[PDB]
Amino acid sequence: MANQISLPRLVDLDWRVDIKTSSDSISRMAVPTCLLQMKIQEDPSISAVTVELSKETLDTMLDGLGRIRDQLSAVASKLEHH
Amino acid sequence: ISLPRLVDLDWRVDIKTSSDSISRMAVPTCLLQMKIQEDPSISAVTVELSKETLDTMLDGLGRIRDQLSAVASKLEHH
Amino acid sequence: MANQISLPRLVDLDWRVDIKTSSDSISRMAVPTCLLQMKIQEDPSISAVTVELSKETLDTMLDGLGRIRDQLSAVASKLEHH
Amino acid sequence: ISLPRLVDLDWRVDIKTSSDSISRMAVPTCLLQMKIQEDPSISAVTVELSKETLDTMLDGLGRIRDQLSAVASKLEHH
Amino acid sequence: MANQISLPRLVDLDWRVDIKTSSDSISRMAVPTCLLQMKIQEDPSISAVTVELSKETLDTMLDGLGRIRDQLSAVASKLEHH
Amino acid sequence: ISLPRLVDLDWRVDIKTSSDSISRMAVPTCLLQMKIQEDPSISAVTVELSKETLDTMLDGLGRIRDQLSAVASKLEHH
Amino acid sequence: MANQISLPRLVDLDWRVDIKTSSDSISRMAVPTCLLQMKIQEDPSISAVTVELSKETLDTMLDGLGRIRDQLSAVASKLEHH
Amino acid sequence: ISLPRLVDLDWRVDIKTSSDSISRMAVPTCLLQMKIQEDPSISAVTVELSKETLDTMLDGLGRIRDQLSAVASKLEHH
């Protein structure tokens, strides 16, 4: 059919930046970290997924989502050319 | 302590029928699968994203990136 | 007793047909796939089960459900003959 | 990516007492167990089906089959 | 403290008797079976546990619950004797 | 097919403080743990039972026992 | 960001003291035990975690929570000294 | 029988931004992870605690400790 049913929807994205004790240092060295909360909905019935993100993990997420954006745009371009 | 961590990101681009379109034009959609590890026992969160939701995601995560880098810098000079 | 309690009930069946990139081809070859959503209810408390179906899996489902139909009809026939 | 896939289908035909029947005639019922794999970690969805629900299921899945085959054909000639 | 909090409560017990095809016979031999549904509540938030019971499993359940009854009565007897 | 089956039954008798008693008399209570197998992957349902709830349980399960035996007998002579 | 999102909140703590038969004695020797119920909330959506606690486990919990208190106070002290 | 037992306790002290503060002063917070075993198959309950919630926790658990010790003593002399 058309798009009437669909996989869960990401409907909220929030975050917090904490300072914590690092694990890469023998001494008392503080390092930042992200707490990320995504709220996901099914078409009501909202769930929350909370993860802890480092800088490198965030950069990798950003690269991946950029590649997804590029693939979506290329498919849209091929679709507009019937 | 071991908070849940995003350890993999996979995706697929599908083409589906549009529901709102008068011209019935097909539309691209992203199936996004995030793999979260908690510790083994990895879970998978699957969502469907449109282009606009992905763009907004990117904007928010870039803001997180900038804030994290600013805090890192202020910690280095502290 | 009689049929007052009962196992969960299938109360909705919906689907979508997507075009995706195939895995059986080295080149860029598109293949269709089904997203099937079944809504299941307990006698209220509705849950959703979404699966991805290929053509062959769908044909096998159809064979199985046909065999179930045949067995139900044979049992009904034996029941009408006391 | 690995969306959940139906990997097994099993069933049993029971005879139960009818609740609506004036004549108290016994009635056949199907216990249907679908095994869904996501990847190991297979889950099982169990439902009870009457003959009419099964018939409607069959009709819907046949419609899916026809639509899938039509899309396949239009992709081959595309 | 006293008994203010408590483990989940069994708040409903229902069942059905089905006839099914047996597994102990090569031929078509029908055998009865029980579908048992227990409804369990937390002190609201009701859940349902459905199991399939054979005659022997039911007899064993009955023996176990009888032994529990005997132990509860013996403890009550010791409590009434301060 | 493999419906969930009760495969173990364990219990403990505790003594707790009574909440309704004027005389504050202690009271026995049963912690009941049913182990259910579905197939490995056994789950555990824990409840708390009073003497009266246990008695009612026993009555209901005895009724199930009698009904099952009657159906068995009518199948043997069928 | 600031503290707008947050991990689940502990919002209730209740308990009961039971007498049970001990496992360290061959004879009939009674021993106390704690049933502890913690109610945890997400910012609505309250869940209950019930555990059985022995005296030694409780003492260890108390030591751990005291160490947490000390670390929180030391961090607060370092924060007040800019 | 095997009721769920708390088998590990881990924690982290973070510094976060305060939301109610006029002076925007940073504030310490505790991320607390309790590991519960039921029997293998250990689960993890994570909460965030402020200093006041921790103090109240400590008071309640100390009351439990005193009650448990009093019952132990009255059992020894029983």
Residue numbers in the entry:
A (entry chain B), C (entry chain B), E (entry chain B), G (entry chain B): 1 to 43, 51 to 89
B (entry chain A), D (entry chain A), F (entry chain A), H (entry chain A): 5 to 43, 51 to 89
Quote the original article:
The COMMD (Copper Metabolism Murr1 (Mouse U2af1-rs1 region 1) Domain) proteins are highly conserved in metazoans and unicellular protozoa. There are ten family members that play key roles in intracellular trafficking and in the regulation of transcription. A hallmark of the COMMD family members is a highly conserved C-terminal sequence of ~70–80 amino acids called the COMM domain, which has no known structure. The N-terminal domain of these proteins, which we refer to as the HN (helical N-terminal) domain, is more variable in sequence across the ten proteins, and is proposed to ascribe unique functions to the different family members.
We determined the crystal structure of the Commd9 COMM domain to 2.2 Å resolution by single-wavelength anomalous dispersion (SAD). The overall structure of the Commd9 COMM domain is composed of two cone-shaped chains that are tightly intertwined with each other to form a globular dimeric module. Each monomer is comprised of an N-terminal three-stranded β-sheet capped by an α-helix, with the overall arrangement making an open, hairpin-like structure. A simple analogy for the COMM domain dimer is that it resembles a left-handed handshake, where the sheet and helix from each monomer represent the interlocked palms and thumbs of each hand respectively. The overlapping C-terminal α-helices of each chain bury a large hydrophobic surface area of approximately 2100 Å2 (nearly 1/3rd of the monomer surface area) supporting the notion that the native state of COMMD proteins is to form dimers via the COMM domain. There is a very high degree of sequence conservation seen in the hydrophobic core of the Commd9 COMM domain, particularly along the α-helical surface mediating dimerisation. The high degree of conservation, and high degree of hydrophobicity within the dimerization interface strongly suggests that all of the COMMD proteins will form obligatory dimeric structures through similar mechanisms. We attempted to mutate several interfacial residues, but both the full-length mutated COMMD proteins and isolated COMM domains were aggregated due to poor protein solubility (not shown). This provides further support for the essential nature of dimer formation. The COMM domain fold is structurally related to the repeat domains found in the PUR (purine-rich element binding protein) family protein Pur-α.
